[model samples]
Target: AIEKRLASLLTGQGLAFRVQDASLPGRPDFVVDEYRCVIFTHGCFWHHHHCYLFKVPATRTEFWLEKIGKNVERDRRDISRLQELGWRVLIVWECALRGREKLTDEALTERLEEWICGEGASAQIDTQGIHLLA
Candidate 1:
C-alpha cells in the first residue's frame, strides 16, 4: 500500500493532500493544492519504468510492450501537461517503495518534503533517490 504509506508520511508533516484528484491531468494519487503540486505513484511495470522492478511478461511480450509503452507515453504527456499548467509534479515509483533497493521511510519522506516545498517544477523519487526532472 504505497499510497497509504506515502499519505501517512505526508500527514506526519501536516501537509494537506487530496487523493485521486480527478481534477488534475492524470488524476494524480495525491494533490497538494497548498503547493500547487501533484504526486503520482506509478507502478514500475505499468509505467514501463527503466528499472529492475519492471519487466515485460514473457507470455504476451508484444501485448505487454504496447500496453506499457502507451502508459509511458501517457505519463510523459500527463507530466508535461501538469508542468505547463504551472503545477509541480512528483513521480514516486514503486521501486522506491518496495524491494531490497527501496528507500527507507525517513529518507523518502525527507526527499518528498524537500521537493514539494522547493522551487523545482518536477522531480521523481526512485530506487536511487530524488532527482529533478528536466
Candidate 2:
C-alpha cells in the first residue's frame, strides 16, 4: 500500500522509476535509474525497525524474534552490498508514511525529491525525518 502510494507520488512528479529490479541486492522496491538510487518501502515489523509500529508477537515469541532478528541483519547486509555497488539507498519506513504521525504527502514528496536530486549515499526517512546512514 505504501509502495503504491510512493510510486504514484513519484510518477506524478515525473520521475522515472523501476519496480523491484531483481538485479539489485535487495530487489529494491523502486529504482530511480537516472538518479542512481534505490528506494525501499520497508514495513517496520517485517524489517524489525525500532519504531512505534513494531512489537514482538506474543505467540511463537522465540521463533518470531529469531526470524525478525535475521531479517534485520539481512537488511544491513543488503544495504552494505548495495552501497558497495555504488547505489545510493533510501529507506522509507511504514511508520513515516502512515498512521497518526505520518508525514503529509506534500512534505514526503518534497523530502524525497530533495534526496533523489541531491547526493546522499545512504539514508532513512521515518517519523523523525531523514537520517544519514552512510
When summed lDDT is taken over every stretch of 10 residues in candidate 1, the lowest stretch is 112-121
TM-score of 1: 0.94
1-134 in candidate 1: lDDT tens per residue?
33878888999988998999888888899989999988889888898788998777889799889988888888899899998899998889899987889889889988987888875668888988778778
lDDT assessment of candidate 2: 0.89
For model 2, the stretches where C-alpha displacement exceeds 4 angstroms are: none
CA lDDT scores, all candidates in order: 0.86, 0.89
**Candidate 2 lDDT, 59-80, residue by residue in tens:** 9999999998999889999999
- Candidate 2 local lDDT, residue 26: 86
Residue ranges of candidate 1 with Cα displaced over 4 Å? none
What's the alpha carbon RMSD for model 2? 1.3
